């Protein structure tokens, strides 16, 4: 899994600043494929759920191009070549009202590097918020 969580949200549901941590991404040994392999263009980004449908906002930042990577293990490898964990920062949501259970910062895949990201979604295995106990 990919573990991330918001540690504070300030503002209002539709105009919020999230302080976040992407803590770790465990090794990928399940043969999961990259959902955007073979798209014309695909990026892995740090982004938030922007809509009640869980689609992406304007990314906090883009990490790498991934459309040539067939597997999620390869996506993880490229992320690690570009960035160390943990990833921390703040990002701001201005848009649809979201409750705490609808708020999430994590690693998204998406066709666009920036701007609102309706075709972006969390990578498979993303556990946003409280992990399992
Ligand atoms: Zn947003």
Author numbering: 25 to 157
Sentences from the paper on this structure:
MrpH resides at the tip of mannose-resistant Proteus-like (MR/P) fimbriae and is required for MR/P-dependent adherence to surfaces. MrpH is a two-domain adhesin (TDA) consisting of an N-terminal receptor binding domain (NTD) joined through a short linker to a C-terminal pilin domain that attaches the TDA to the fimbrial tip. Although MR/P belongs to a well-known class of adhesive fimbriae encoded by the chaperone-usher pathway, we found that MrpH has a dramatically different structure compared with other tip-located adhesins in this family. Unexpectedly, MrpH was found to bind a zinc cation, which we show is essential for MR/P-mediated biofilm formation and adherence to red blood cells.
